[PDB]
Design a protein around this ligand. Structure first.
Ligand SMILES: O=C(O)[C@@](O)(COP(=O)(O)O)[C@H](O)[C@H](O)COP(=O)(O)O
Ligand SMILES: O=C(O)[C@@](O)(COP(=O)(O)O)[C@H](O)[C@H](O)COP(=O)(O)O
Ligand SMILES: [Mg+2]
Ligand SMILES: [Mg+2]
Ligand SMILES: [Mg+2]
Lengths: 455, 455, 160
């Protein structure tokens, strides 16, 4: 069945759809499956399955229904590009507070359309959200502004936050876990649970939280510096998340505002993120995106990009989200991913297809992680252009030859080197911990700095 | 860095790992990227990023940590097969009730390993859960048994539940929506919200629920038969889900046990499914998997298959989940998908790699949906072997030439035909609504039964 | 929840999993927290199941939370010694609904990975159906143990 006449209107202008402010726009890279309809026909059926229609006409359809049809307004079969306009009336709203839910945006714009039999693949690269819909999203309630304040930094451009992940990913019992925390904090600011760390039988949650709380007090008393921790509170059960969050804050007491909450937002889902966002709005919401690679990878032609995930996360209210190393680390990623960072930090930014005004909605911090160490940092910052962010280096810190504390300081000095505009090798002469990172990871040193041994 | 010696032990035997009952087993189809390590090295790194390790050695590692390492115990580079054993101690547990969470299973077994730079792609096709871990999951609290009981059917092999989806997907205002419900119920049993239907501004939640409740009462009084409805209560906010569920049960009153709760479990996440499962254990939990196609499609080489999704859903506690049309409908799917149904319905069943004993855990109903109609049903049942399930046909019912009521009966008569083992064309002669379905969808009739008009 | 869920915890077949060896901690009242737990440990060396005697709860000489902790210790020690799973049925009976929740929640949190080894006992006849439903609905995943103390006032054939 051909549904082009109803669900496609290429005479529509994007500038007018945007100016109207009554449509969510979504840009897909789509290719029809072979043996079915052409591009516009497939795009039309795509729009139908994403709004008001099914695979056949139904008698129950009326004119009011047609008014809220999602419309294909622009196609480019040569570049496999497809743009669809979704009337904002389609998207579900909370009965309790009239606010928007990302779950509805997902169900419509990238739901059933991913299982279409006449489609080979389709993947969202960008979307635009107008003011009337944008202002209905929670947005972040806590930002890096609040972490900077705890560290005693300026609340505007407070600078680089030295971070790490406790490694091993799993296996440390409560006190050995806390000992690694104390060590790193002697040189660093920020520590986060590795994503699966929680209430394993060999490391009970409450015992670990107490041990870490003790370590924070000892580290802070020792260094005279404020220290931060990001606890994983991910769970299937909403009430388990509350139980964990409430215990952590009560346990840390006067250090409660030094605490961030980590949520495995991609595998646990938006529901888990919102649980954290709404139950603990005064605590930095740390969005961990474990599993995202199943769709965000360029190897995947389905789902949505990392850029889309990151943009959605800001609406959901993540205080910060992992954006990747932009090709400088161990995970898949490219230098062009810097655009993702700008989209979640700025009040106005360009996506791959749409320009987005955020209307003063708070920013989401780019959390940089994945095989980072002191050696790889200068290059990363060159590509990004700033260091006002959190970077966590698990292996990069605890893999340091002189231990976690030295590892922390190497990360600190690595960033100091970049802002100083100094030569890292020349810089190493006057900064031991940074110099010792060359010996900690000689293969990285050999490729990045070919003749470091001579100096 | 080569981590094979630690994270790979091919001398381990699967039969013994299963007999041990201390390991979750996962079977992946993985291909290393070019320019990195070989297959076993990559598989070893995979296990490391999926359990205890990172991309470099850390000083904090001890012998206890090694004891809980995930181990690559079987590989087949020719078939790109990789099997990994996860010690069950790795997986997170609720502090509040000591029970398991699927979120932890996801974070470890298909989390960060999907973003690895040295891997081209990796996708889980099967997993095994031993008794000690299995019994810690919620499992379903309500089954089709409870819907059969409400319909007045036998609680054992109570038979086919005629269902539909209210179409248009969106656009119907409260009363026209309820009118369509009334019409279908004149011939059918079961109605579900189309996945995005909730609290749209043109169709307020509370207004729609009240109108549908009225339709149920009128239809039941008219036909003298019990009728069922599955309401979408999906939301980002846990408390929005509670509010929707509570209002529905209170509104329907003495028909409250006629209500199922639908959750968009893939896009809203496991957290949303558990909210419904635990808040409303006495209400049939209807798992809608919108968006799953982004990873489950055979076109995707990442994430996990529909089989894995469905098996997980049973652990999560879905009363029923969409399993697809198995190649007989509009969506991507194959005839071999019958194995998925058996895995969630039987107490013992075979996966593509692992045999699973469920230890009396309740079954999850296979919900058949996606471009189905009366004509396509006999073929589907032939492949499955039974009709003890819910089938919903949106277009197939409301696309019927004589309307939804006639549409319902065509679905009813279609299954009666298969149950009687009669010839559909011959059967149609004595059953009009079924016969009229041929004219409703002539292309399907022409392809399935080439010479139907003469008779 | 049914006996099937207890059989599963014991590692028994979920169909006709067989006889569950049980006892009641005696004296009915009088044992302090650790002596209570010691008796639990002793019985578990040969048995499967232990229940609070019906009035045992939060007596001043045997505080609830202290006893629960000591019993959890006994279960872990017994299980490590015997290599067998052990069960306990805790009395959570109370006039106050929220007292019942508090007792149940504390027990499950305390036992942690052994939480599914826990049953909840309710004096359903004297406390009433309201108390039984509190447990049934608050803790549907925990075996609900109905104790009928006082029933004889009407159930006896001597009563008409
Ligand atoms: O588990 C890990 O691998 C990490 O702790 C990195 O460890 P290392 O610093 O030791 O490499 C992070 O969770 C990943 O960076 C997540 O990736 P992303 O930020 O792309 O979501
Ligand atoms: O919105 C829809 O398309 C449906 O209501 C079917 O409508 P029709 O009956 O009109 O085809 C179902 O949600 C899909 O079947 C989901 O697919 P799956 O079960 O594969 O997850
Ligand atoms: Mg991590
Ligand atoms: Mg639907
Ligand atoms: Mg007694």
């Amino acid at each position: 069945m051909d549904q082009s006449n109803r669900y496609a209107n290429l005479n529509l202008k994007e500038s007018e759809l945007i100016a109207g402010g009554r449509h969510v726009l979504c840009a897909y890279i789509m290719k029809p499956k072979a043996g079915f309809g052409n591009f516009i026909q497939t795009a039309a059926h795509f729009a139908a399955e994403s709004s008001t229609g099914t695979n056949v006409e139904v008698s129950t359809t009326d004119d009011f229904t047609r008014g809220v049809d999602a419309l294909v307004y622009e196609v480019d079969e040569a570049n496999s590009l497809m743009k669809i306009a979704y009337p904002i009336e389609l998207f579900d709203r909370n009965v309790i507070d009239g606010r928007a839910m990302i779950a509805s945006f997902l169900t419509l714009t990238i739901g059933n359309n991913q299982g279409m039999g006449d489609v080979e693949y389709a993947k969202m690269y960008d979307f635009y959200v107008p003011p009337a819909y944008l202002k209905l999203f929670d947005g972040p309630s806590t930002t890096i502004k609040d972490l900077w304040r705890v560290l005693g930094r300026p609340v505007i451009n407070g600078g680089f936050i030295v971070g790490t992940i406790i490694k091993p990913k799993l296996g440390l019992r409560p006190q050995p876990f806390a000992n690694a925390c104390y060590d790193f904090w002697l040189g660093g600011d920020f520590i986060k649970n590795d994503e699966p760390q929680g209430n394993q039988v060999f490391a009970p949650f409450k015992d670990t939280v107490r041990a870490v709380a003790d370590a924070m007090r000892r580290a802070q008393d020792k260094t005279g510096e404020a220290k931060l921790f990001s606890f994983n509170i991910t769970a299937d059960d909403h009430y388990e998340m509350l139980a964990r969050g409430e215990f952590i804050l009560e346990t840390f007491a006067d250090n409660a505002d030094h605490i961030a909450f980590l949520v495995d937002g991609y595998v646990a889902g938006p529901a888990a993120v919102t649980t954290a966002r709404r139950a603990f709005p005064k605590q930095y919401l740390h969005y961990h995106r474990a599993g995202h690679g199943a769709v965000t990878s360029p190897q995947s032609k389905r789902g949505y990009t990392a850029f889309v995930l990151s943009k959605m996360a800001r609406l959901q209210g993540a205080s910060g989200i992992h954006t990747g190393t932009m090709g400088f680390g161990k995970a898949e990623g490219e230098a062009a991913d810097r655009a993702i960072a700008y989209m979640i930090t700025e009040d106005a930014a360009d996506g791959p297809y749409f320009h987005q005004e955020w209307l003063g909605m708070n920013p989401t911090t780019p959390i940089i992680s994945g095989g980072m160490n002191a050696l790889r940092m200068p290059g990363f910052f060159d590509n990004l252009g700033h260091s006002n962010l959190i970077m966590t280096a698990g292996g990069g810190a605890f893999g340091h030859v002189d231990g976690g504390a030295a590892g922390a300081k190497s990360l600190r000095q690595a960033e100091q080197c970049w802002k100083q505009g100094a030569d890292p090798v020349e810089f190493a002469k006057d900064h031991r911990e940074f110099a010792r990172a060359f010996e900690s990871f000689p293969q990285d040193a050999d490729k990045l700095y070919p003749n470091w041994r001579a100096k």
